[PDB]
Write an enzyme that holds these catalytic residues in place. Sequence first.
Site, PDB file in Angstrom:
ATOM      1  N   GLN A  10       0.952  -1.148   0.057  1.00 53.72           N
ATOM      2  CA  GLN A  10       0.032   0.135   0.199  1.00 53.72           C
ATOM      3  C   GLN A  10       0.932   1.259   0.169  1.00 53.72           C
ATOM      4  OE1 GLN A  10      -3.738  -0.138   2.128  1.00 53.72           O
ATOM      5  NE2 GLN A  10      -3.607   1.830   2.921  1.00 53.72           N
ATOM      6  N   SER A  90       3.581  -5.214   4.983  1.00 52.99           N
ATOM      7  CA  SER A  90       2.144  -5.485   5.247  1.00 52.99           C
ATOM      8  C   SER A  90       1.529  -6.396   4.003  1.00 52.99           C
ATOM      9  CB  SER A  90       1.624  -4.157   5.665  1.00 52.99           C
ATOM     10  OG  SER A  90       0.199  -4.157   5.793  1.00 52.99           O
ATOM     11  N   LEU A  91       1.005  -5.562   3.034  1.00 48.95           N
ATOM     12  CA  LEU A  91       0.096  -6.040   1.989  1.00 48.95           C
ATOM     13  C   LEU A  91       0.811  -7.208   1.323  1.00 48.95           C
ATOM     14  CD1 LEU A  91      -2.404  -6.603   0.414  1.00 48.95           C
ATOM     15  CD2 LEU A  91      -1.616  -4.446  -1.070  1.00 48.95           C
ATOM     16  N   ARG A 115      -9.728  -7.265   3.796  1.00 50.45           N
ATOM     17  CA  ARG A 115      -9.172  -6.974   4.781  1.00 50.45           C
ATOM     18  C   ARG A 115      -8.688  -5.561   4.672  1.00 50.45           C
ATOM     19  NH1 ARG A 115      -3.384  -5.419   4.309  1.00 50.45           N
ATOM     20  NH2 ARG A 115      -2.120  -6.085   6.058  1.00 50.45           N
ATOM     21  N   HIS A 198      -1.459  -1.232  12.070  1.00 46.37           N
ATOM     22  CA  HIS A 198      -0.478  -1.929  12.936  1.00 46.37           C
ATOM     23  C   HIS A 198      -0.374  -1.575  14.164  1.00 46.37           C
ATOM     24  CE1 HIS A 198       0.503  -3.607   9.099  1.00 46.37           C
ATOM     25  NE2 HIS A 198       0.783  -2.665   8.577  1.00 46.37           N
ATOM     26  N   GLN A 247      -0.952  -9.455  12.020  1.00 47.47           N
ATOM     27  CA  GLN A 247      -0.272  -8.566  11.243  1.00 47.47           C
ATOM     28  C   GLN A 247      -0.783  -7.144  11.222  1.00 47.47           C
ATOM     29  OE1 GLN A 247      -0.407  -8.685   6.966  1.00 47.47           O
ATOM     30  NE2 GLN A 247       1.762  -8.687   6.685  1.00 47.47           N
TER      31      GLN A 247
END
Length: 316
Positions: A10, A90-91, A115, A198, A247
């Site tokens: 992202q 992340s993604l 998500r 996060h 995560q």
Amino acid sequence: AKLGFLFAGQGAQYVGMGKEFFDNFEESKEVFKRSSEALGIDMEELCFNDPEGLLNKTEFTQPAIITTNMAILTALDKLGVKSHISCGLSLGEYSALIHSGAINFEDGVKLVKKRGKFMQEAVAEGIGGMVAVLRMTPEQVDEIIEKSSPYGIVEGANYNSPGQIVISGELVALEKAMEFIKEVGGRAIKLPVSAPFHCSMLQPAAEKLEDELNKISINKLNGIVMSNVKGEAYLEDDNIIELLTSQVKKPVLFINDIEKMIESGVDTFIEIGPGKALSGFVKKINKNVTVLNVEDLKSLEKTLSKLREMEVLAEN
């Protein structure tokens, strides 16, 4: 040994991403077709034109990037560029798990749309945010977190490279953290995001993502995928759903992931998907490893050109 894959995430999205691969590789064309079929939306239009203005809406950003990452990866694969050690930030952890065969592509794209929705909706607009933290070690940031926590939630969110951390939490507490960071010789930049990714505030998104994860089919991993939560490889006795649940609400240990990849013998990193953010982080972690990227024709050709040097050097 040799090659490690890094998948874009992202923040690196842009209108027209994927298009050059779409037009020039049949297998990349096919990936977009499948994403559209799976999602019931025109993914070509979303990525190439974005006429409704969705590309920067996280619900839509996530399956947009995931599709783009896959379209590029598939063409790389047909060209013989391969690796069994990968990760994301992340993604892009999802693109790595799909690459591993643990998750199917169609399930991948459908899942990350959900998500992205959950992460964006977890906290109301204007209450939480994220702050870039420069020129501070993790330990220093722990001291900041300590001082700022009586003002509300502040937690480490990203550990991207030496002197590049992100913290997230409540805006009101984040404001105090920024003050404290200044006083001690670091720098803090309020990021232009309206969701405290996060940290523990995304607990409601983790629960919703868990429920979704439990519905789909999850297979054994091929090769090695680094976990953002763990700061190290998924092991076969690990719970995948839980590591993916955690995560969204825990720190992204990207720096540790890279470090472990290098430990494991990767000397050549290929960033796959839009942008060069992860390349940028790797080069600051370790100045010696080869770092490459593919997002379009020019970067592809640069990358293939570098790989052909190294393979000729092998013929020896």
